[PDB]
């Protein structure tokens, strides 16, 4: 790519490999190593993509947006947070997309790109969320806590 | 925890939540938010843990080691790389553990903790590997390439 | 402090040591190791402080602002950029404050806190500027270039 | 350069601009923007160079070494620490070079490239040291403390 690849790749059902690059693009690479397409964001893509059931590719960007990209490389939507999105998204069973932001919030975004809820931690959320079998969302914060957040966006507990 | 939680949590079969902390520990937290155990490495744990089929927890540390920790919090083994292990391990179908290192290599480590092979890129491997259906290992590098490596440790292709 | 001290300390004329912390504060510490004061910003202070000729302390914050703090620990002014200010400010002979931002610009800010000019690079400006004898401002960018900018904000040259 | 320029430039007496690059080189650039020379280290140069009284250029590398490079671009010596040297060196009145390392130590190195002392903190030393009028060396650590070290390498105080 044109820059450091710190983003961690994700693999689609047809074998397409998606990865972000410091050069600001989300890349879609065919299994044979040739470019399928590249999608330009406004900043470094350190966030690692996640792939929804319908093939939508979600990734954060240093330009403060969470991107939802169709398998053809055209934008589905982008959601603006208050700060760099270095956290990597996780997708719930109903399609909700969860991601942390440098602006200290954990975001829950509906598949349509509208905010479901946002939960304020005390510091940047660089950690990438994990979703439990019951739907609990776990994520670390720069504020030293591991958070457990219920599906409705309320604190379950925080572990110092 | 005692420090920033940049590591991304992983959830075990019984619901235990594992996460690293900048305070040098790998944490195991019960579903109720109470400590199960904390394992001290020699440096910040920014790497995100992966869980094997038998419940072993693998994570890298800034102290240059890849750790394999038993579900009870006791060390199974540790493997020394040449630099900080910020990359998050991936586990193959056969149990091979793949992880990047700041020393520029992608490591393949067998379940018993012995090196299978190491693949030298041109720069730090902070990207976390993904594994395709056919066993190909994909990982980004600070040298600007996305690498596709065969399970035998030989290059398939690299995408600038 | 309450968090990692990645910021690099600066020493005032009277020996006071100033440093930022990941806990969001700018610290002013007496030579005997006791707190003089701490100033809370909205986010991690990774930027390293610079000290003006009248003792004003300038530092960037993860909350996107460049801060000017009086020697007594009270805010003089804060200037909002479009992104995290990890770059460390430099002070020109005339008192102009130069600092990079995650929003890709090198900023020149007058002593009164108003914009003098902003220069657009191709990527995040984490590098901290240096000032030559003739006033040229040098800074690196995530876009791979070392920039030389004239005092009037116009490009002198860019070295790939 | 061939990669991101996160290193902060330093300016020599003749106006030469020195800066590290993520492409592993330390660059020396003439005031007119043309390359004077480049020196290859083994890893990314995020550390910001310092210039000694005699013109020696000191800089850390992600390859774990502190480099001393002569004005003509030839290696004078390199000093191996136990981890990445992202801290930027400072030079004391007697020529001692101080720098932090990811291996948790603050290093004091003699001008001949041999160890004077190293001081163990509780975590990675990414902060760049500053030197007070009486020779006290101040540096932050990932362990949350600002350290004040006497010139003999013994603790003066640490500020949480």
State whether D132 and C27 contact (CB < 8 Å).
Answer: no
Residue of C61, C123, C160 best to disrupt the A interface, most CBs of A under 10 A: C123
CB A5 within 8 A of CB A22: yes
Q: What is the CA radius of gyration of chain D?
A: 15
Q: Which two tokens stand for residue C111?
A: 């002593």
Q: Whole-angstrom Cα distance, residue D137 to residue D101?
A: 15
Give B-chain residues touching D83 at CB under 8 angstroms.
62, 64, 83-84
Q: Whole-angstrom Cα distance, residue C36 to residue C9?
A: 14
CB B85 within 8 A of CB B47: yes
Resolution in angstroms comes to: 1.8
Burial annotation C48-78 (CB, 10 A radius, 16+ → b, else e): bbbbbeeebbbbbbbbbbbbbbebeeeebbb
Q: Whole-angstrom Cα distance, residue D148 to residue D129?
A: 10
Q: What is the CA radius of gyration of chain C?
A: 15
* B70 and chain D in contact, CB less than 8 A: no
Counting beta carbons within 10 angstroms of the beta carbon of residue A75, is it exposed (0 to 12), middle (13 to 18) or buried (19 or more)? exposed
Q: Whole-angstrom Cα distance, residue D44 to residue B83?
A: 13
Q: Whole-angstrom Cα distance, residue B11 to residue D153?
A: 45
Locus of tokens 């240059």: B64
Q: What is the CA radius of gyration of chain A?
A: 15
CB D27 within 8 A of CB C159: yes
SS3 C112: coil
> Which residue spans within chain D are E strands per DSSP?
10-11, 17-20, 25-29, 35-40, 50-51, 57-60, 65-69, 75-80, 90-91, 97-100, 105-109, 115-120, 130-131, 137-140, 146-149, 155-159
Rounded to 5°, the CA angle B18-B23-B24 comes to: 70
Closest residue on chain C to B4 (Cα): C3
Closest residue on chain D to C32 (Cα): D157
Report the candidate in A95, A98, A93, A96 with the shortest Cα–Cα distance to residue A130: A98
Report the candidate in C109, C43, C39 with the shortest Cα–Cα distance to residue C74: C39
DSSP A53-94: TTS-EEEE-TTSEEEEE-TTS-EEEEEE-SS---SPPEE-TT
State whether C62 and A124 contact (CB < 8 Å).
Answer: yes
Measured in whole angstroms, how far is the alpha carbon of residue C119 from the centre of its chain? 16
* B1 and chain A in contact, CB less than 8 A: yes
Query: In Å, how far is D76's CA from the nearest CA of chain A?
Result: 30
State whether C123 and A43 contact (CB < 8 Å).
Answer: yes
State whether C158 and D33 contact (CB < 8 Å).
Answer: yes
Q: Whole-angstrom Cα distance, residue B61 to residue B56?
A: 16
Q: What is the CA radius of gyration of chain B?
A: 15
Query: In Å, how far is B93's CA from the nearest CA of chain C?
Result: 38
| CATH T-level topology, domain B10-122 | Lipocalin (2.40.128)
DSSP D114-146: -EEEEEE-SS---SPPEE-TTS-EEEE-TTSPE
* C112 and chain B in contact, CB less than 8 A: no
State whether C124 and A43 contact (CB < 8 Å).
Answer: yes
Give C-chain residues touching D32 at CB under 8 angstroms.
157
Give D-chain residues touching B61 at CB under 8 angstroms.
none
* β-strands B105-109, B10-11 pairing: unpaired
Measured in whole angstroms, how far is the alpha carbon of residue D101 from the centre of its chain? 9
Closest residue on chain D to C125 (Cα): D6
Q: Whole-angstrom Cα distance, residue C98 to residue C87?
A: 9
Q: Which two tokens stand for residue D35?
A: 């390359």
Question: In Å, what is the CA distance from A144 to each residue of A46, B18, C61, C158, D103?
Answer: 21, 15, 19, 40, 22
Question: In Å, what is the CA distance from C51 to each residue of B84, B141, C92?
Answer: 34, 38, 11
* D3 and chain A in contact, CB less than 8 A: yes
Three state DSSP letters for chain B: CCCCCCCCCEECCCCCEEEECCCCEEEEECCCCCEEEEEECCCCCCCCCEECCCCCEEEECCCCEEEEECCCCCEEEEEECCCCCCCCCEECCCCCEEEECCCCEEEEECCCCCEEEEEECCCCCCCCCEECCCCCEEEECCCCCEEEECCCCCEEEEEC
Question: In Å, what is the CA distance from D105 to each residue of A86, D47, D129, D139, D142?
Answer: 29, 15, 12, 11, 11
Beta bridge partners of B98: B90, B108
Domain ranges of chain C: 10-159
CB A50 within 8 A of CB A59: yes
Locus of tokens 């305070």: B23
Report the candidate in C115, C32, C36 with the shortest Cα–Cα distance to residue C79: C115
Beta bridge partners of B119: B106
Question: In Å, what is the CA distance from A116 to each residue of A91, A96, A112, A153, B29?
Answer: 13, 8, 10, 9, 27
Report the candidate in D100, D102, D109 with the shortest Cα–Cα distance to residue D146: D100
Alpha-carbon dihedral angle through residues D92, D67, D30, C137, given to the nearest 10 degrees: -60
Report the candidate in C152, C105, C149, C97 with the shortest Cα–Cα distance to residue C126: C105
Closest residue on chain B to C23 (Cα): B4
> Which CATH number among 3.30.379.10, 2.130.10.10, 1.10.357.10, 3.40.228.10 corresponds to the domain A10-159?
2.130.10.10
How many C-beta neighbours within 10 Å does residue C110 have?
14
Breaks (C-N over 2.5 A) in chain C follow: none
């Amino acid at each position: 790519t044109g820059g450091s690849v710190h983003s961690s790749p994700a693999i689609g059902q047809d074998g397409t490999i998606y990865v972000g690059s410091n050069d600001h693009y989300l890349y879609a690479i065919n299994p044979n190593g040739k470019l399928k397409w590249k999608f330009e964001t406004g900043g470094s893509v350190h966030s690692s993509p996640a792939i929804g059931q319908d093939g939508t590719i979600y990734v954060g960007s240093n330009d403060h947006y969470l991107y939802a990209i169709n398998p053809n490389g055209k934008l589905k939507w982008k959601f603006e947070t208050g700060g760099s999105v270095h956290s990597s998204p996780a997708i719930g069973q109903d399609g909700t997309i969860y991601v942390g932001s440098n602006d200290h919030y954990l975001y829950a975004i509906n598949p349509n790109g509208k905010l479901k809820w946002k939960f304020e931690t005390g510091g940047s959320v660089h950690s990438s969320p994990a979703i439990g079998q019951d739907g609990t969302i776990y994520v670390g914060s720069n504020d030293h806590y591991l958070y457990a957040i219920n599906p409705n966006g309320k604190l379950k507990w925080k572990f110092e």
